[PDB]
Amino acid sequence: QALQKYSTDLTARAREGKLDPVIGRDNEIRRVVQVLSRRTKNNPVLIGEPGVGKTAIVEGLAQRIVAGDVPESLRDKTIVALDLGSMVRGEFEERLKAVLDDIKNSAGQIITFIDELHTIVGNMIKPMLARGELRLVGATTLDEYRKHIEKDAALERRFQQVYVGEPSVEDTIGILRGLKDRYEVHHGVRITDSALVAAATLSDRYITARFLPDKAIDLVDEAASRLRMEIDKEEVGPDDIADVVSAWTGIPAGRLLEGETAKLLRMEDELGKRVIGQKAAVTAVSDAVRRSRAGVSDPNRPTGAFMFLGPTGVGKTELAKALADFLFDDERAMVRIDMSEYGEKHTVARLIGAPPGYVGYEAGGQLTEAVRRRPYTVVLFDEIEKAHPDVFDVLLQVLDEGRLTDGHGRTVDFRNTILILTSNLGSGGSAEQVLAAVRATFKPEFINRLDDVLIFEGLNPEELVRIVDIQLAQLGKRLAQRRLQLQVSLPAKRWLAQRGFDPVYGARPLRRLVQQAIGDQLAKMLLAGQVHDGDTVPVNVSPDADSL
Amino acid sequence: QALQKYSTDLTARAREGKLDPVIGRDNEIRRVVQVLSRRTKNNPVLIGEPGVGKTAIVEGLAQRIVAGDVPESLRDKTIVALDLGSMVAGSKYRGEFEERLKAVLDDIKNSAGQIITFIDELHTIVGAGADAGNMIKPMLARGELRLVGATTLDEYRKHIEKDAALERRFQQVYVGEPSVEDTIGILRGLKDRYEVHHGVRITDSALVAAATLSDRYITARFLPDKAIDLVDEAASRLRMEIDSRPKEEVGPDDIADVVSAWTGIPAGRLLEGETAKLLRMEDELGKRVIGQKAAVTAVSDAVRRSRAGVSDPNRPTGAFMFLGPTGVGKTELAKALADFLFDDERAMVRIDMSEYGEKHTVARLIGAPPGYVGYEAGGQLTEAVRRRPYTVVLFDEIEKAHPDVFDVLLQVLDEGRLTDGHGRTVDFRNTILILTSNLGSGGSAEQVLAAVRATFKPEFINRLDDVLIFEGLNPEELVRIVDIQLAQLGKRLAQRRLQLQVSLPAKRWLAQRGFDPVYGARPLRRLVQQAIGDQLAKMLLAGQVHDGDTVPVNVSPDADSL
Amino acid sequence: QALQKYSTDLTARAREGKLDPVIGRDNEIRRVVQVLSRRTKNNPVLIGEPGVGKTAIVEGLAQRIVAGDVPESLRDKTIVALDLGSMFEERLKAVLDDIKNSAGQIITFIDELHTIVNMIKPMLARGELRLVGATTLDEYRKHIEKDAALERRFQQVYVGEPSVEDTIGILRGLKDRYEVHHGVRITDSALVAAATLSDRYITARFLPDKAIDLVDEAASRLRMEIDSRPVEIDEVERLVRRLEIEEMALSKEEDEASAERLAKLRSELADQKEKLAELTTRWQNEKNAKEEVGPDDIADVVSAWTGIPAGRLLEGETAKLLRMEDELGKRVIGQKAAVTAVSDAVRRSRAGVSDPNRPTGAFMFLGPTGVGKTELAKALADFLFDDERAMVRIDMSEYGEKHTVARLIGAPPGYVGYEAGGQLTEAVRRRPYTVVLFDEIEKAHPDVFDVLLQVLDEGRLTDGHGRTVDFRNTILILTSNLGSGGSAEQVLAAVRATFKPEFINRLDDVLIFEGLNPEELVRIVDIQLAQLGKRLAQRRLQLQVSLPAKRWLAQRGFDPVYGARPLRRLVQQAIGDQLAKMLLAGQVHDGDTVPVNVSPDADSL
Ligand SMILES: Nc1ncnc2c1ncn2[C@@H]1O[C@H](COP(=O)(O)OP(=O)(O)OP(O)(O)=S)[C@@H](O)[C@H]1O
Ligand SMILES: Nc1ncnc2c1ncn2[C@@H]1O[C@H](COP(=O)(O)OP(=O)(O)OP(O)(O)=S)[C@@H](O)[C@H]1O
Ligand SMILES: Nc1ncnc2c1ncn2[C@@H]1O[C@H](COP(=O)(O)OP(=O)(O)OP(O)(O)=S)[C@@H](O)[C@H]1O
Ligand SMILES: Nc1ncnc2c1ncn2[C@@H]1O[C@H](COP(=O)(O)OP(=O)(O)OP(O)(O)=S)[C@@H](O)[C@H]1O
Ligand SMILES: Nc1ncnc2c1ncn2[C@@H]1O[C@H](COP(=O)(O)OP(=O)(O)O)[C@@H](O)[C@H]1O
Ligand SMILES: Nc1ncnc2c1ncn2[C@@H]1O[C@H](COP(=O)(O)OP(=O)(O)O)[C@@H](O)[C@H]1O
Known part of the structure; x- marks a missing residue:
């Protein structure tokens, strides 16, 4: 009572009700x-994540004390934080x-309470502890406790761990609706x-990023205050909250609604905005993704295991680069692993990394270490037909049970990813011998487990226009x-087509072809004159090259 | 007035009787x-591992001094803690x-030789430096202060032995843990204080x-307190149960209740109802495994033996190896067991021995020795059994692992021991090892029992219990296998x-299709999927099937129809 | 009422009407x-950096407060500091x-509380003062990010700098006040x-005050040059005066070796004297027909800041850059494909076309040894800074360990090497304009790559103290010799399997040098002999x-496995050996010229 300047009270202000009733967590x-x-x-x-209700529990304990429900061993005691x-060097x-x-002069059992004690731990208070005068209640997180209370502790023999995991949705809902009338008078609109x-x-x-009991209340109170400030809808x-979540993240409040039908019905041209042609392909892949997310197939399997083959550079990768954007919300989600190193017997274990204590161990595998973190990728396989016939064992193990075991000992799961197996077969085969070749080259019962094996059709010599128009409207930026x-x-x-298509590399050069030409050919004018920001810069076909 | 604000008075504290009655340790x-x-x-x-009673000896000497039970030249020494x-608390300055x-x-030293001192956990005396904890040596090696101390073995080795010139001034009294008998004696001494603290009887x-x-x-802990803690917890637990709820x-059995509440292990004396479950086991387990009557009896008898109290308490609770034809239901029996006595089909620890074809890949389940890349991670198997020490360990198809991995199970079995890289030990004493294979695959009981003896060695076959041979799928009962599959689907x-x-x-046709005697019931789940689930996934997304429809199936001449 | 002395007021200053111009930030x-x-x-x-306008934010808040745009709980709120x-x-x-005695009507604004955080914390846990904060982000993270004891009563409000169309209005609202001292027109x-x-x-600094300091310094510079002789009329005059005194002290030199230094200092004086006259003559033209x-003075102050060149078109820099591919061919020979590429990316930065958040150029060339993959970078650094010493060259062969990442980043606070700062960051933090050379990138630990992965497409990185140095105006070069024997597929596969593809992703064109030939070797023999003469x-x-x-030389050392270094070895061994044999045996004393000629096998001097 003489040095009460670095500590607060919990039972005194509980005679005033300055605390919230603590329904839940009994x-x-x-x-x-x-x-x-x-x-x-x-x-x-108390051990748990931050913002879960540790302090809330100790406050409820204080309130049960002032009310009187505990045994008389604990009756008639105060709590101090x-x-x-x-x-906070020193002092x-x-x-x-x-x-x-x-x-110690308290000369009783006046229980304390220390929040984030792992800032204290040490050897200064253990004699105070092992004598029977103080009683501390603490708070931290699991990894902190494992750090400051496990390596140099030697005091773990007098601290008991109590776990506070996190509330459920249906439970934090009751918490919220209990903590409601308060704000209904603080701001006061309606709830x-x-x-x-x-x-x-x-x-x-x-x-x-954050956790439930306060994460939800944050949004609720911020939105109520925004609605109060609006009156410069009663x-x-x-929607009055999805708007807040959108202003918080960045994603618009429209898409923040149904995520099954409002997604499956978008599997239309929203893919074809980034991919071009191949409408049979896009429709087939959309069928695959729709009927797989229905909820009747085996729960332990990839979400799609189709492959597609044919000519190069027509957009084989681009379909996947676009598909990753629509479903997993990024184009930096795909992972591409060439099946060209994997042409030997031994290198098949490079994509796991086998033992603890050998060359590639902490580097992890190529296929798994890129999955156990961010388990929502879109795995590609360039020129699978060149991989050694031992990778197919790992592959079949994947697409027959959604799990795999890396070198460390972890367990990785493939039950919500998408496999994709490209190929350059189909040199001359249109649709007749190409399937014979892919039925004779790969194992026959492997392809029994795949999905559709759709074949990309060549770029219609007229339908170079759409791709080049996308390229050009892009470079308009x-x-x-x-x-x-x-x-x-x-x-x-169109003069770009007959001189830049090169159907041995698909349509790969048509980006450098045009960017270097236009940019670094104008790089003289863009410095001297001939142009301003109202000039369409008329460029045309000289009889030989592309002058202005 | 210096050793009054930096110390207590332990002998005076013993005079007021605020100490527990040291029993034994003479x-x-x-x-x-x-x-x-x-x-x-x-x-x-006093050196010894943590919890074995190293301070208690000093309180014992204190009580003895007070009572006057010491030799001639040790009366009235008034030891000081x-x-x-x-x-070292408040000082940020030179020479403070x-x-x-x-x-x-x-x-x-200004008082006569009558202030026997006592620094507990003295491995925190080497620091204090920034030439400190070092002024004490000239008074140490001259018999001026007594300095009774007490630290852990590991802390002693790590902190003191780096300062050999100070280890010379200490005599190590080795305090070893007591056996069960001395622990019982100590508990008999200490029962009264707990009986008075918690208003119960023991x-x-x-x-x-x-x-x-x-x-x-x-x-993992040590005896004199590892035992006291169970008593304390059960007493407090019973007190709470008596209060707050409007033979005592x-x-x-309360102690068994505690020691089973944590560690998970079902140690106890067979509370009622559990006995009914155990008696009704051969059939309750049969609801998920059709046939194989000769094998389920062995497993059930093993579990009953283990929990009835007649089983070698230091050896695994069962080390069966059952092998036979393909797709007969071996792994499925294993999973059915694990789901039976754990209520979680993934509460088991299965390793797939098809991956250890190469010699070196053993290190995954051991760990790597000191000084190598993956060292502080430990071993997979060791760390997976050190926690959850009650699971069912499964070795799928131990016939691909080339004959150098066998020699680790060769001492896993028959003692339940295994050591990781750090030199620890795990106890397999209360798991059930199960390891399947495929040797034989169709032959008589003497055309597989010979391949076993040519693949494995006497030192290993001699370790395990019965070598069960699984039968073939009787062409009459497959309707029940199909019924199990359909139950799963409906769920x-x-x-x-x-x-x-x-x-x-x-x-009948679904059973008749896809049960070839070469593969058993293996191509059945895939068939049910491809012939019902696909057809209905096409039929649910395109209307004409909405929730509630008791969808009927039919048996059209060709592949099944709806 | 006892704070009227210890604190200013903004409830009364706002009624009187004096406040700094606050536009935007509503x-x-x-x-x-x-x-x-x-x-x-x-x-x-408030979280940001110095000079964003959060001071102005609170000032406009106060003006809006005194005007009245508030909810019910804001009865003028008499905000104070x-x-x-x-x-x-x-x-x-x-x-x-x-x-404390007030009912929350005199709420305070602790300008720069980052150092304030005993006394305010318990008086905050009861909830009586608002204590509006405004600091910077790094100091925030250091002081009051890890202490959750007080983070339950502080909601950070981010602010950005740029409001260009209203920054000009702010300049206007201040243009009046800068034309008074400086007798100039802004x-x-x-x-x-x-x-x-x-x-x-x-x-380096931020718009809302750097756009202020540019105009302030331009005003001061103009006010200075309004004095009779302006800049570049005060420069060549101070040069020619000094130059003369350097000539009148060399005539009285009884030396023959300083005559050639007297015969040139005279000339440069004769060349600078004219350009003094030409400007002086043209001066009177504007005197009878800058104020x-x-x-133009803007770009002037830009160039004099951070060394970065940024002008309209700087009238001495015009024909150099169109001559770059050819000007660079004085030092590096061959690799037309590589010189075209390295060149087309310096103009696109001096033109203003390239991407503004990425290095002004960052790409790799690799190939066999002794081709020029280092002389090219040296030649590049020589004609942008006019001295080759001005290139930051770090070797990735010493960074073969993991814990050597802190060698070029610095060590965390509280350790031994702390005040020493980094090694790569501490060179680009001060005067960032250089080219950074990464010698033998292959030999590095495949963990420093994760730092360049940050520098690519973000333009910065963090060090041991926590600040972020910028990497947006430099060129990043990578050198290596992977493969070194394969045509194009072995080296392509090697680099693709050695670096992540998402590291090669942000890179520009990847270059593969060819190797030298007989026709390009005579041009190198000439460079060697010219350097030897110099x-x-x-x-x-x-x-x-x-x-x-x-021709004998350029034919002798050619073997297409080591490149060009054998040429330097042969030059030394065949000429310098004999010459140094004679030079200390007399007979070739100073002031002499010895001819060489082909003999059957050697070439006698
Ligand atoms: N059962 C509950 N009853 C009432 N309020 C609760 C309950 N659980 C959580 N809360 C509230 O949730 C918020 C979380 O606050 P805290 O309990 O301080 O968070 P924490 O889990 O203790 O971790 P800290 O202290 O915030 S780092 C507070 O507003 C609590 O009042
Ligand atoms: N011989 C004994 N007689 C009576 N009580 C004992 C005896 N040995 C141990 N105990 C009790 O068992 C516990 C042992 O704890 P302590 O010996 O005080 O701690 P410790 O043995 O020093 O281990 P650390 O390393 O100090 S945590 C205490 O509750 C003692 O009272
Ligand atoms: N008696 C049985 N009761 C129920 N399902 C069974 C039975 N026998 C086989 N099955 C089914 O057969 C399928 C595969 O059986 P498994 O036990 O996995 O084959 P296996 O015993 O592992 O033999 P291999 O050599 O590993 S293929 C599963 O879907 C089981 O449900
Ligand atoms: N095309 C060239 N232009 C200018 N100097 C060249 C050329 N080719 C070779 N040299 C000279 O030959 C030597 C080669 O220098 P470097 O460029 O360091 O060699 P390199 O091509 O980098 O091979 P490595 O892999 O670095 S050993 C230097 O003395 C250069 O001056
Ligand atoms: N249908 C298409 N829609 C959009 N871009 C396409 C299409 N087909 C090809 N492209 C373009 O062709 C180029 C080749 O892409 P990709 O197939 O990934 O190349 P590669 O096979 O060399 O990896 C890209 O620029 C891609 O955008
Ligand atoms: N929007 C604005 N436009 C023009 N001048 C401003 C604006 N906001 C503030 N000012 C004035 O310019 C100064 C710029 O520095 P200031 O915003 O005070 O920075 P800080 O308070 O973060 O140190 C302000 O102090 C104020 O006098």
Whole structure:
């Protein structure tokens, strides 16, 4: 009572009701009060993620004390918190010893409470502990406890671990609707259970950084305040919260709705916006992804295991680069592993990395280490027909059971990824001998487990226009830093085709071909003159090359 | 006035009786006294692993001094419990801790030789530096302060032995843990304090059960406190159960309740109902395994033997190897067992021995020796059994692993031991090892029993229990296999309200299709999928099938129809 | 009422009407009042960097407060500050008691509380003062990011700098105040040029005050040059005056070796004297027919800042860059494909076309040894900085260990090597314009690649202290010799299987040098002999080599497995050996020229 400047009270202000009723989490209080009444290894410590309700539990304990529900062994005691940030090189221990003296002079069982004790731990308080005068209650997280309370601890023999995992959705919903009338008078508009459950599920779904009991309340109170500030609609609602979540993340409030039909029905041209032609292919792949996400197939299998073959450079990779954007929300999600190194017997274990203590161990495997983190990729396999006939064992093990075991000992799961097996077979075969070749080259019962084996059709010599038009409308962005406009002339743009297609490399050069030509040919004018940001820069076909 | 703000008075604390009654440990106290009464270098240090009672010896000497049961030249010495945390606490300056330590030393030596000191966990005396914890040596090797100490073996080795010139001034008294009998004696001494703290009663049968179970199942801690803790927990637990809820003493089954609540192990004395479950086991397990009557009996008898109290308490709870034809149901029996006695079909630890064709890949389940790349990670198998020490270990198809991995199981079995890279040990004493294979595959019991003897060696075949030979799928009962599959399918189709109406001809044909005697029931799940689930996935996304439809199937001449 | 002395006021200054120009940031003000009208985690803190305009944000907040645009809980709220120009712990009770007795109507604004955080924390846990904060992000993360004891009452509010179209309005709202001291005119041309030019180029400070300091320094520079003789009329005059005194002290030199230094210092004087006259004559033209700020002094102050060149078209730099591919062919021979590529990416930066958030160029060339993959980078660094010493060259062969990543990043605080700073970061933090050479990238530990993966497409990286140095105006070069025997597929596969494809992704064109041939070797023999002459011109012993001699040389050392180094070895062994045999045996003393000629096998001097 003489040095009460680096610590607060919990039972005094509980005579005022300055604390929230603590509905939920009625088991942890029994656990704590049971550990607090032993003879040794008493004075527990709460262990859990930040923002889950550890302080909430200790406050509820204080409130049950002031009410009177505990055994008389614990009856008639106060609780005091400790702020570690109020002290901090040195003199931290001076104030700490001045505090411990007061605690000992308390001459009773006046229980303390220390939040984030792993800032203290040490050998200064253990004699205070192993004598029977203080009782501390703590708080930290699991990995912290494993660090500051496990390596140099030697005190783990007097701290009891109590776990506070995290609430469920249907439980934090009750928590919220219990903590509702408060804000209904603080701001005061109106509250709908629809808004509450919407906040809960949307935070759970898209806010993957924080945790539930406060993560939800954050959005609820911020949205209520935004609605109050609006009055410079007299109700709150689910859209009234999706707008907040969108202003929080960046993704628009439209897509923040149904994710099954509103996705399967988008498998239309929204793919064909980035991919071109091959409409049979896109429709087939869309069937594959739709009927697989229905919810009747075996739950332990990839979400798609189709392959496609034919000519090069027509967009074989581009279909996957676009598909990763629509489903997993990124084009930096695919992983491509060439089956050209894997032409020997031994190198098949390079994509796992076998033993602890050999050359490639901490480097992990090529196929697994890129999956156990971010398990939502889109795996490609260039020129699979060249891989040694031993990789197929690992591959069949994948697509027959959604699991695999790396070198470390971890278990990885492939039950929500998409396999893709490209190939350059089909040199002359149109549709007749190409399938005979791919039925005789690969194992016959392997292809029994695949999905559709669709064959890309060549670029229609007219349907080079759409791809080059996408390329050109893209490069229309290039010189927007100067706002210079571009000229198009269908003879010139078609003159790129017959001299840049090169159907041995698909359509690969048509990016450098045009960017180097236009950019570094204008690089004289763009420095001297001849152009400004209203000039379409008329470029045309000289009888030989592409002058202006 | 220096050793009053940096120390307590342990002998005065013993006078007020605030200490627990040290019981036994007479050789150690006699050695400590005969070391503490020397002429020069009278400094004993109690060394021993954590929890074995190293401070209790010093409190015992304190109580003995108070009672006057010490030799001639040791009466009224008033030992003192020094501490350094309250000295190195406030000082950020040059020469500030040294004046404190020098005042303390001067006050100890200005009094006559009657201030026996006591620094506990003295491995925290090597620091204090920034030439500190080092002023103490000239007074140490001259018999001026006694300095009874107590540290752990590991901490001693790590901190003190790097300073050999100070280890010379210490005599190591080795404190070894007591056996179960001395632990029972200690508990008999200490029962009263707990009986008074918690307003309950404690029974000697419960004490014996604590000291015994605390030694067969908790194989990481040490005895005199590992045993006391069970008593304390059960007493507090019973007190809570008596209160707060509007024959009242701890019994020899509450301790089993605790030691089974944590560690998971079902150690106990067969509470009622569990016995009914165990008796009704051969059939309750048959609901997921059709046939193989000769094999389920062995496993069931093994489990019953283990829990009835008649089984060698230091050897695995079963080491069967069952082998036979292909797709007969071996792995499936294993999974059915694991689901039976754990309620989680993945609560087992299966390793796929088809991957160890190369010699070196053994290190995955051992770990790597000191000084190599993956060292502090440990071994897969060792770490997977060190926690959850009650699982069912499974070795799928141990016939590809070339004959150098066998020689690790050769001592896994028959003792339940295994050592990782760090030199620890795991206890397999209460798992069930199961290892399948495929040798033979169709032949008589003497055309497979010879291939076994030509593949494995006597030292290994001689380790395990019965070598079960699985039968063939009787062409009459496959309707029940199909029924099991359809039960699984219907359970999967319950997020909606769908049901199935499979006709007898449909079921009969489904069994008749895809059960070739060369592959057994292997190509059946895939067939059911491709012939029902695909057809219905095309039929659910395109309307005309909505939740509630008891979808009927039919047996059209060609492949099945809906 | 006892804080009227220890703190200023903004409830009365706003009624009187004096406040700095606040335009924009109205959404920020709305965010601040919105977070103030909450129950928990209210009372925000502003996060940014010095000179973004959060001071202006709170000032506009105060003006809007006195005007009235508020909710009900904001009855003018009499927001005040707590003057950090008022600084002991016995007075702070007297300061805090006034706010404590109030009902939350005198809320404070702790400008730069980053150092304030005992006394304010318990008085915050009861919830009586708002204590509006404003700091920077790194100091925030250091001080009050890890302490969750106080992070339950602080909601960080991010702010950005650029408001270009209103930055010009701010310049206007300040243009009046900068024309008073400097007797100059600050034109809208200058406003809009500085608002538009120093933004991407001078990327060390931030627009809302760097666009201010540019105009301030331009004003001061112009006011200085208004004095009779301006810049570049005060420069060649100070040069020619000094040059003369260097000539009048060399005539009285009884030396023959300094005559050639007297015979040149005279000439450069004769060359600089004219350009003095030409400017002086043209001066009177403008004297009878600069007195105002424009767009040229802007680029002037840009160039004089951070060494970065950023002008309209700098009238001495025009024909150099179109001559680059040819100007570079004086030092590097062959690899037309490589010189075209390395060249087409310097203009696209001096033109303003290239991507503004990526290095001004970053790509790799590799191939056999002794081809020029290092002489090319050296030649590049020689004609941009005019001295080859001005290239940052780090070797990746010493970084073969994992824990050597902290060698070029620095070691964390509290360790031994801490004040020494980094090795790569500490060179690009101060004066970033150089070219950084990564010698033998293959020999490095495949973990430093994860740092260049950051530098690519982000343009910065962090060090041991936590700050971020910028990498947006340099060129990054990679050298290696993977394969070294394969045509094009072995080396392609080797680099593809040695580096991540998402590291080769952000790279520009990947270059493969060919190797030298007989036709390109005579041009190298000439460079070698010219450099050798320039070297032994310190004893005035010029050489005289014949065409059969140069052909004998260029034929002798050619073998297409080691490149060109055998040529230097042969030059030394065949000429310098004999020459140094004679030079200390007399008979070839200073001031001499010895001819060489082909003999049947050797070439006698
Ligand atoms: N059962 C509950 N009853 C009432 N409020 C609860 C409950 N569980 C969580 N909360 C609230 O959730 C928020 C989380 O606050 P805290 O309990 O302090 O978080 P924490 O888990 O203790 O970790 P810290 O201390 O925030 S780092 C507070 O507003 C609590 O009041
Ligand atoms: N011989 C004994 N007689 C009575 N009680 C004992 C005896 N041995 C151990 N105990 C009790 O068992 C526990 C042993 O704890 P301590 O010996 O005090 O700790 P420790 O043995 O020093 O281990 P550390 O390393 O200090 S944590 C205490 O509760 C003792 O009272
Ligand atoms: N008696 C049985 N009761 C139920 N399902 C069975 C039975 N026998 C086989 N099966 C089914 O057969 C399928 C595969 O059987 P498995 O036991 O996995 O084959 P196996 O015993 O592992 O033999 P191999 O050599 O490993 S293929 C599973 O779907 C089981 O459900
Ligand atoms: N095309 C060239 N232009 C200019 N100097 C050249 C050329 N080819 C060779 N040289 C000279 O020959 C030597 C080769 O220098 P480097 O460029 O370091 O060799 P390199 O091509 O880098 O081979 P490595 O892999 O670095 S050993 C230097 O003395 C160069 O001056
Ligand atoms: N249908 C298409 N839609 C869009 N771009 C396409 C299409 N077909 C080919 N392309 C373009 O052709 C080029 C080749 O892409 P890709 O197939 O990934 O090449 P590679 O086979 O060399 O890896 C890319 O620039 C890609 O955008
Ligand atoms: N939007 C604005 N436009 C023009 N001048 C401004 C604007 N906001 C503030 N100012 C003035 O210019 C100064 C720029 O520095 P300031 O914004 O105070 O930085 P800080 O407070 O972060 O140190 C302000 O102090 C103010 O006098």
